[PDB]
Amino acid sequence: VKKAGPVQVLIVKDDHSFELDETALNRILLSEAVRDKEVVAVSVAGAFAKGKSFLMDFMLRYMYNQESVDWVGNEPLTGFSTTGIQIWSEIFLINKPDGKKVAVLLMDTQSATVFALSTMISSIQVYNLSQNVQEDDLQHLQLFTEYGRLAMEETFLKPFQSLIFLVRDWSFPYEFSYGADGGAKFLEKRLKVSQHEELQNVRKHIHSCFTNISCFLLPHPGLKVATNPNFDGKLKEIDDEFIKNLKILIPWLLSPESLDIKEINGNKITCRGLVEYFKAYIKIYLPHPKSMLQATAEANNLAAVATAKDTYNKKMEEICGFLAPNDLQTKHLQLKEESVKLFRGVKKMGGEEFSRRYLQQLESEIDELYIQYIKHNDS
Numbered sequence: 001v002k003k004a005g006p007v008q009v010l011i012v013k014d015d016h017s018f019e020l021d022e023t024a025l026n027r028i029l030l031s032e033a034v035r036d037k038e039v040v041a042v043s044v045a046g047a048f049a050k051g052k053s054f055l056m057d058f059m060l061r062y063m064y065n066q067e068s069v070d071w072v073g074n075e076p077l078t079g080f081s082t083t084g085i086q087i088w089s090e091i092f093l094i095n096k097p098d099g100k101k102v103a104v105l106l107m108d109t110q111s112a113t114v115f116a117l118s119t120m121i122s123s124i125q126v127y128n129l130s131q132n133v134q135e136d137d138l139q140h141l142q143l144f145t146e147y148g149r150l151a152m153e154e155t156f157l158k159p160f161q162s163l164i165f166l167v168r169d170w171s172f173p174y175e176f177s178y179g180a181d182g183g184a185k186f187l188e189k190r191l192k193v194s195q196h197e198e199l200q201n202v203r204k205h206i207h208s209c210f211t212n213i214s215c216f217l218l219p220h221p222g223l224k225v226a227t228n229p230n231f232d233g234k235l236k237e238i239d240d241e242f243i244k245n246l247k248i249l250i251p252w253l254l255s256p257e258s259l260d261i262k263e264i265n266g267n268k269i270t271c272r273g274l275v276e277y278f279k280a281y282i283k284i285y286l287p288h289p290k291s292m293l294q295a296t297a298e299a300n301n302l303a304a305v306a307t308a309k310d311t312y313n314k315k316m317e318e319i320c321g322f323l324a325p326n327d328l329q330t331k332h333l334q335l336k337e338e339s340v341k342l343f344r345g346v347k348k349m350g351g352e353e354f355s356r357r358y359l360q361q362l363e364s365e366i367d368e369l370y371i372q373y374i375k376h377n378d379s
């Protein structure tokens with residue numbers, strides 16, 4: 001009755017207006033099992049019909065069986081099948097080596113608005129490119145560069161985490177070998193300071209905006225894959241050198257040691273908090289660097305509101321799950337001040353005056369809960 005599958009959370013509509021399916025986003029990210037888990041947000045983005053869903057379906061095979069030597073698979077390819085973002089409804093909980101259980105969210109990003117949105121949300125952004133990295137391909141990164149400068153004016157903390165140029169159908173395998181090492185060699189050459197003055201500046205600045213930039217060169221997958229849209233054939237019908245490098249690529253993106261937890265201004269993000277980033281970014285969607293930065297600070301403060309409120313809520317439920325009215329008030333005022341202190345201790349963006357508004361929202365939401373608890377205790 002219940003089965004994982006792709007869920008449309010962002011849709012472009014026919015009037016060219018973007019809409020966020022908050023109900024669907026909440027249903028997937030606010031489940032009891034994942035809401036408080038730190039999240040790795042994985043996105044595959046790029047031009048239409050360049051093999052993104054095909055890649056993601058192999059990413060699914062690995063995620064569902066990370067510990068299997070045969071995870072890759074005559075087994076047909078299933079999973080992800082215009083403009084928008086689809087997310088996989090199974091938020092994978094993966095054991096990290098440090099003892100954390102992290103949430104892993106996969107997003108298929110199929111427009112510059114959708115591309116900017118997925119990059120702001122992601123902590124691993126796979127930029128899927130066909131055959132080569134073109135100047136237009138780098139020009140798309142320029143707004144992220146300019147947002148990064150404004151964000152870093154007063155801190156050394158970078159706004160973005162991992163970016164991967166995944167070059168499909170690679171053409172030059174002698175000088176730049178298939179895989180990550182040839183890709184790094186190639187990317188260094190392509191990024192070497194130029195071209196149009198705007199593209200010189202993207203090259204100068206891009207490494208300052210991203211914690212990790214890398215590049216993987218993938219072979220052509222063979223005629224059968226290249227020619228049939230719904231390629232329902234054997235793994236034996238896929239080029240063997242493609243499969244060899246695919247088996248390296250996917251754990252290189254997604255192994256437990258590889259998963260990069262989303263973080264902003266030093267704060268690890270939870271699935272609960274990540275919803276606040278979707279909601280703040282959808283409102284500004286191209287926007288200005290200042291509008292992008294203000295949306296980031298707003299989500300950053302609201303993620304702290306959500307964390308402090310949930311803390312007060314679960315500790316109060318543990319208390320009302322009959323107490324004297326003044327013992328219920330005293331415990332309320334104590335737990336409320338603890339959540340207030342929790343919120344004040346978070347390193348939040350925007351400045352004290354900016355954050356005062358969100359502290360007052362926190363206090364109001366906490367008082368809303370308290371009145372519910374009194375009614376539950378009067379009963």
Ligand SMILES: Nc1nc2c(ncn2[C@@H]2O[C@H](COP(=O)(O)OP(=O)(O)O)[C@@H](O)[C@H]2O)c(=O)[nH]1
Nearest residue numbers: 048049050051052053054168225226228229231
């Ligand atoms: N040439 C080429 N085609 C591919 C590759 N990977 C998948 N395809 C084929 O590209 C077509 C479109 O793939 P799809 O995953 O739907 O592209 P998407 O729109 O980016 O999600 C299908 O026929 C795939 O079988 C690749 O590495 N190179």
Ligand SMILES: [Mg+2]
Nearest residue numbers: 052053108110
């Ligand atoms: Mg797609």
